[PDB]
Amino acid sequence: ETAFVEVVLFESSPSGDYTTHTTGLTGRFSRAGAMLSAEGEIVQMHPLGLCNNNDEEDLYEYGWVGVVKLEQPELDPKPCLTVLGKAKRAVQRGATAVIFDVSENPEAIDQLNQGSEDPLKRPVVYVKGADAIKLMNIVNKQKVARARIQHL
Amino acid sequence: ETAFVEVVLFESSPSGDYTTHTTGLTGRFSRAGAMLSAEGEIVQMHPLGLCNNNDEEDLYEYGWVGVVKLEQPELDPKPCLTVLGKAKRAVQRGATAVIFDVSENPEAIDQLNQGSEDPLKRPVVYVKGADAIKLMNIVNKQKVARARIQHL
């Protein structure tokens, strides 16, 4: 159930070319989703961005990997969707995978694994710890980055 | 060493739903490349376009899955690069994986395995027979398609 995540970050050269930079992180496949690998360009999502008006413009170019840092649970107490619901909505919107940074809402792990009986066909990964920090520092400062999620 | 390939065609709807069609097929990871999963937008290359230097190198956004249908060897007398060279060049040009349809040149399988001692860090996949046909009939109709290459 360990999720080996590779992030390919593109760093602007002074000539305005870009330089590939690869970083390694580790998370866990949630029992809520497939035990499969996935790869695609990272799109950061705010978690309250995964409540549905069901608009066409919400469908990102098929195959993106969504990165969602969960807020402290006493901040969005009337949440549109469960964390599990948010993962599904991400997949409906074209996500090949979702990574949850569960650092500020570690109870979210349990909330996901309760959906274990009807799992998503796509992987749902959670990160925390330094591994979440590394990913978020890439994502916050990274205009374009690509994630490769490898199972085993 | 079996590569499980899914080719997903996709279409945004005004209704706010992705419509998808997934075709499943089987190929093999060459020893020429990493034994790793990979996923990205499919780009069809004519095998001659994996030749000359640097004009077309950044044509395609990093992360694409190259589909190259080989020609019979005698058609291509003076080959700019070996089939192995062609695979390496695709990866220099951003490819996250390469799929060769080796139907018209099955000696390519042996050529690729010659580079087994110094494999690429990205997977190099081949298909033939009915698997190659399904793949090519989707790729030739020139819509946008994602390929998912699952190692086991």
Numbering used by the authors:
A (entry chain A), B (entry chain B): 54 to 205
From the paper:
Rspo (R-spondin, also roof plate-specific spondin) proteins are evolutionarily conserved from fish to humans and have well-documented roles in a broad range of developmental and physiological processes resulting from enhancement of canonical and non-canonical Wnt signalling. ZNRF3/RNF43 specifically targets these Wnt receptors for ubiquitination and turnover, hence reducing Wnt signalling responses. Direct extracellular interaction with Rspo proteins inhibits ZNRF3/RNF43 activity. Here we report a molecular level analysis of the ZNRF3/RNF43 ectodomain structure and its interactions with Rspo proteins.
